[PDB]
């Protein structure tokens, strides 16, 4: 489909909304991302039964997480959620609405992880935090009132990468705790090898994820560009056998579309149960716009339901 | 994606009498229904009085309660084949996951009952669900319509028919790879995924359904035949599921977009790696299982609205 | 490809009176024609007698000799705009590279002369080239037809018209991003590349051309209006050029394939990174220069045949 | 478009035509390729005014080339042509028909190069030969009766790779002799980074270039897999500035489609004049089937004409 009518206007408004340029400093981009994000969060105005912030001891130091509990009960399913933002931007705050809605619709406790950001903390800082936090959720199921046997990982964009890699790390360690993975338009190839979608939808006219911003993200994340060949950076090059069932959500007008769909297919070739759906008429990051985009609401509903019944399994 | 590996395997394994093709489709469908092995809390067959006589329906009740949400479901089969039986697993599972009463409508089949036979029954069945909320133990303000392939067409047209009479009982429409253009105006996808190598929906079978369904070629120009040419304003919110390797993909995706252009909230999602009719294969296809989960949940929260 | 960089730059730079839009198109076209700065060995304007009166044509002779190959060329402009002047550079260059005499036909424009006006002239002009080989110094066994956009439509329909009368003077047809379906039956590409951001062929301009061209909506069902619905058997070999970012892409590619299905040799090639009408931009677009080179050469060796 | 009606039959016939498997020895695959190729060559039955075989001294030893002269005259345009075959298969013989027709239609002398094959001669053996032969043509213009100022490179598939890399090598050396490049469905990314087309069209049902055969080619060509990162292996990662005007021909149902179209686009981004055309309804290698495929005839006509007027320039 063409770009949704309402989304043209949304991008039109972000046209003269202080645009990104490669020489901008990280603090300014972070601030703008947070402020813009919080408009959408406040718009959503999601309820939640119970919410609190906790500290998880990571290899790199204390890791903050937000626990969203949508109902009472001592053995609820859990989702460890990783926010997007290019490995450089975002926080539990920027994605607070998505996490509340996810909890409410799935009935699962959502644990949103405030993983360390680049360039202050280069790859593999965030990957370590992401595994450490998910493992801690498994180990501390009792304190949390969750079922240690019903933990899923999930994340959007750079967070989809962290979810995918956490599942790989658990697999590599011979661990059972990741039962399900939902990858929301993940980045799975962090090298400069192109796909058609990466070039097709990354021009300045798409705004949300441009070629300039992608390269800038890549420069912040990596100590040296060859680090991108690591399967913990580019999980599309990993051994994909024995990974947990996967739902991969993609967007039609998204640079990362091709690689997301390729990841789903490659999972299948190694015997993993895996589904790839493409949301038509929308851009990368569309889920965060759900208060004003019907595709965003449909996506949260699908993701929530897929986790609740582990439908792909 | 390419074609999912198990689906290639299945396909590689796989002027006729209308009665003979029905038996074959029936036989094949029931293999999948038995594989599903789905439970249901309560199930019963009823007789909806319709304009062409008694319309058989099957009521799937997943739980107790008055004022449950409702889904009027229309089975696929190209307007000529299929029954409440061929789609029983999908309806049990839909009922169970959505928490809603599903009324599966055994609409009149062509070529015996040609267009607009099935369309009248589709509308009569749905409005009868609307007029009997109390007896059904369903809420008259939470009625959805849903259907697959030729069923998706009836679902969409039932919504159009209700709109046309100023009726507002249709609150939500899930169109599972629907047929919205029944004329021969080709789309890229219609030509691309209709070769013999696809089997389930070939150019020959499509042309054959069309000859069974219509009394004359020109009847496909009707908005009740080809909803994609109808006025789409003031229609209920829509979820349109499409398959990647499906002749009807393009028209399905176009229908969602045309709905948007007339101010209706609507979402088109494409399941990669799969063919038309993949929902019925859910017991051996993860895409099938995800679709039923999405459809159930989208109806439960009316997410697109 | 994405949109080629220079073309984005060009686009970013860029109830009306029919006369006013013509002047604007004319003015814009002539900028490109002067940029081209093309030579021609011999050029002259002639008056072909046609069924609606005198049809102006322009004869471009690239070299000496009797029995040169011939190309009857039809300019674009949505049936309403354009002239032999707006496409002069393309015809000089075509003539020069193919070695063939190009007869550019100044067909009658709508809304003054509505369908089937231009179609009769298109056929009359071509058959007149056929009947006057001697006077033109061209071979009556080496006649091709060619045209861009609305011109591609006339080229294809002229071939259909000749076929319909048992006439065999049309030996080859090059359809440069043709309009083969003039009904509103949407294709994915028609919706995808017709937004205001594309400018050259928007949904509004297409709907406007259609209202100028036809006396009534139903006339677009004619095979002389929408050739993609005509019988395509026994038609001359075809080269179909399409643009990647073009509303008419899908129907263009479908026309080549439908030709194949009726046993006609036909090739569809898609130029990436470019929009409808890109051939006329050849002086600043390498894709334009390649297209003219391909078209000239394909006609010279009748390569698809 | 769908797969051409006649091409289904062609692939149907190649279904039970002794199919490839990864453990086959190189000699057997070479023999089958040659025999199959020569059916098409004999079918074409192309004339040529003058033809002879010569020896070109390369860094690695004598290099055989075939000179196709379509007309008389002492300063004709030239095309140095590189046959396809995965870097492992093929010869001047397998592509003899295409070269004669090219010469005849373009009016250029075609020099078809019998470059060294893998695994006997690993990368960069063939790349060295390909540059050496093109340079020799420039240096020996007088002996050949060609214009040293009007030399083009051209090649199909693995040969498109060699043509692209020869142009890069000349550029890197600050040389002017390559004036034009025609890349016929080239392979420009020899790493295992996927594109959608690479996965979509490489199943056994397409026969001509399957995932199995692509990996086998890759194993023969490279001494070690990391050699594939070299820009002389994967020219899509090279600096593409100041390269000669480019025509890139692609096929709709070809694993290499995406990367070919990406190469054309990337050339443009560095200011190179570059056109990508996609032939619908056909597979990789379709040009060699021109006696029975109208798309093959159209392609040779286009390629010939583009070289004759250097139309993209």
Tell me whether residues D311 and C298 touch, CB distance under 8 A.
no
Contact partners, residue C57, CB within 8 Å, separation at least 6: C45, C46, C47, C48, C84, C103, C104, C105, C106, C125
Query: Chain C within 8 Å of B244 (Cβ-Cβ)?
Result: no
Catalytic residue among D114, D129, D156, D254: D254
Class of residue D59 by CB neighbours under 10 A (exposed 0-12, middle 13-18, buried 19+): exposed
Tell me whether residues C290 and D277 touch, CB distance under 8 A.
yes
Of C2, C182, C173, C208, whose CA–CA distance to C72 is shortest?
C173
Strands C266-275 and C238-245: parallel
Q: Which CATH superfamily is domain D1-313 in?
A: Alpha/Beta hydrolase fold, catalytic domain (3.40.50.1820)
Cβ atoms within 10 A of the Cβ of B221, count?
11
Tell me whether residues B297 and A304 touch, CB distance under 8 A.
yes
Residue of chain A whose Cα is closest to the Cα of C193? A2
Query: Chain A within 8 Å of C186 (Cβ-Cβ)?
Result: no
Residue of chain C whose Cα is closest to the Cα of A198? C2
For C1-305, give the CATH class. Answer: alpha beta
CB A211 within 8 A of CB A203: yes
The 3-class SS string of chain A reads CCCCHHHHHHHHHCCCCCCCCCCCCHHHHHHHHHHHHHHHHHHHCCCCCEEEEEEEEECCEEEEEEEEECCCCCCEEEEEEECCCCCCCCCCCCCHHHHHHHHHHHCCEEEEEECCCCCCCCCCHHHHHHHHHHHHHHHCHHHHCEEEEEEEEEEECHHHHHHHHHHHHHHHCCCCCEEEEEEECCCCCCCCCCCHHHHHCCCHHHCCCCHHHHHHHHHHHCCCHHHHHCCCCCHHHCCCCCCCCEEEEEEEECCCHHHHHHHHHHHHHCCCCEEEEEEEEEECCHHHHCCCCHHHHHHHHHHHHHHHHCCCC
Q: With contacts defined as CB-CB under 8 Å, which chain C residues touch D274?
A: 286
Q: What experimental approach yielded this model? A: X-ray
Tell me whether residues B185 and C183 touch, CB distance under 8 A.
yes
Q: How far is CA D26 from CA A253, D62, D121, in A?
A: 44, 22, 13
Of C34, C43, C99, C95, whose CA–CA distance to C280 is shortest?
C34
**Residue D254 annotated in active site:** yes
Question: What is residue D169's three-state secondary structure?
Answer: helix
Q: How many residues does chain A have?
A: 313
**Residue A254 annotated in active site:** yes
Distance CA A276, CA B287 (A): 8
Tokens standing for residue D87: 């870097």
What does DSSP assign to residue C220? G
Distance CA A68, CA C273 (A): 47
**Angle at the Cα of D297 from the Cα atoms of D296 and D298, rounded to 5 degrees:** 95
Query: Chain C within 8 Å of A16 (Cβ-Cβ)?
Result: no
Tell me whether residues D280 and C273 touch, CB distance under 8 A.
no
Tokens standing for residue A250: 């993609």
Catalytic residue among D157, D197, D202, D306: D157
User: Which chains are within 8 Å of B by 3+ CB pairs?
Assistant: A, C, D
Distance CA D66, CA D68 (A): 6
Catalytic residue among A157, A197, A202, A234: A157
Residue of chain A whose Cα is closest to the Cα of C5? A203
What does DSSP assign to residue B206? H
Q: Which of A191, A197, A261 sits opposite D193 (nearest CB)?
A: A191
Distance CA D122, CA D126 (A): 8
CA dihedral D231, D236, D239, D245 (to 10 degrees): 120
Chain C interface, best mutation among B181, B182, B187, B242, by max C CB count within 10 A: B187
Q: Hey, which residues 211-230 in chain C have their CB within 8 Å of chain B? A: 228
Residue of chain B whose Cα is closest to the Cα of A295? B267
Class of residue D9 by CB neighbours under 10 A (exposed 0-12, middle 13-18, buried 19+): exposed
Q: With contacts defined as CB-CB under 8 Å, which chain A residues touch C2?
A: 199-200, 203
Tell me whether residues B188 and C188 touch, CB distance under 8 A.
yes
CB C216 within 8 A of CB C222: no
Q: How far is CA D66 from CA B34, D34, D166, in A?
A: 67, 17, 18
Distance CA C146, CA C291 (A): 13
Distance CA B273, CA A261 (A): 9
Distance CA B122, CA B153 (A): 10
CB D221 within 8 A of CB D87: yes
Chain C interface, best mutation among D271, D278, D286, by max C CB count within 10 A: D278
The counts of H helices and E strands in chain C are 10, 8
Distance CA A293, CA A298 (A): 9
- Record the resolution, in angstroms: 2.0
Tell me whether residues B1 and A297 touch, CB distance under 8 A.
no
**C194 CA: distance to closest CA in chain A (Å):** 10
Active site residue ranges of B: 149, 246, 276
Query: Chain A within 8 Å of B303 (Cβ-Cβ)?
Result: yes
CB B170 within 8 A of CB B162: yes
Distance CA C125, CA C57 (A): 8
Q: With contacts defined as CB-CB under 8 Å, which chain D residues touch B1?
A: 199
CA dihedral B18, B20, B24, B26 (to 10 degrees): 60
Query: Chain D within 8 Å of C9 (Cβ-Cβ)?
Result: no
Distance CA D67, CA D96 (A): 10
Query: Chain B within 8 Å of D2 (Cβ-Cβ)?
Result: yes
Question: What is residue B302's three-state secondary structure?
Answer: coil
Distance CA C62, CA A123 (A): 65
Q: Hey, which residues 188-207 in chain D have their CB within 8 Å of chain A? A: 189, 191-197, 199
Strands D61-69 and D109-114: antiparallel
Query: Chain B within 8 Å of A294 (Cβ-Cβ)?
Result: yes
Question: What is residue C279's three-state secondary structure?
Answer: helix
**Angle at the Cα of D79 from the Cα atoms of D77 and D83, rounded to 5 degrees:** 165
Q: What pairs with residue B54 in β-bridges?
A: B49
């Amino acid at each position: 489909m063409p770009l949704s009518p309402i989304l043209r206007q949304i991008l039109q408004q972000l046209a003269a909304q202080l645009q990104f340029r490669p020489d901008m400093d990280v603090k300014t981009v972070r601030e703008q991302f947070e402020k813009s994000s919080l408009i959408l969060v406040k718009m959503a105005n999601e309820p939640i039964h119970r919410v609190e912030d906790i500290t998880i001891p990571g290899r790199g130091g204390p890791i903050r997480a937000r626990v969203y509990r949508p109902r009472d009960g001592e053995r609820l399913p859990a989702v460890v959620y990783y926010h997007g933002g290019g490995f450089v931007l975002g926080s539990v705050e920027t994605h607070d609405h998505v996490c509340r809605r996810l909890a409410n619709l799935s009935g699962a406790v959502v644990v949103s992880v405030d993983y360390r950001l680049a360039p202050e903390h280069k790859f593999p800082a965030a990957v370590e935090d992401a595994y450490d936090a998910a493992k801690w959720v498994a180990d501390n199921y009792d304190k949390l009132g969750v079922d240690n046997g019903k933990i899923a990982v999930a994340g959007d964009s750079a967070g989809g990468n962290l979810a995918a890699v956490t599942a790989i790390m658990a697999r590599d360690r011979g661990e059972s705790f990741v039962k399900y993975q939902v990858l929301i338009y993940p980045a799975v190839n962090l090298t400069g090898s192109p796909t058609v979608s990466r070039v097709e939808y990354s021009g300045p006219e798409y705004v949300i994820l441009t070629a300039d911003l992608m390269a800038w993200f890549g420069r912040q994340y990596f100590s040296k560009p060859q680090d991108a060949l690591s399967p913990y950076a580019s999980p599309i090059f990993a051994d994909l056998s024995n990974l947990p069932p996967a739902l991969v959500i993609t967007a039609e007008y998204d640079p990362l579309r091709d690689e997301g769909e390729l990841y789903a297919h490659l999972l299948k070739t190694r015997g993993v149960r895996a589904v790839a759906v493409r949301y038509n008429g929308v851009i990368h990051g569309f889920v965060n716009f759900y208060p004003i985009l019907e595709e965003g609401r449909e996506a949260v509903s699908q993701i929530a339901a897929s986790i609740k019944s582990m439908a792909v399994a």
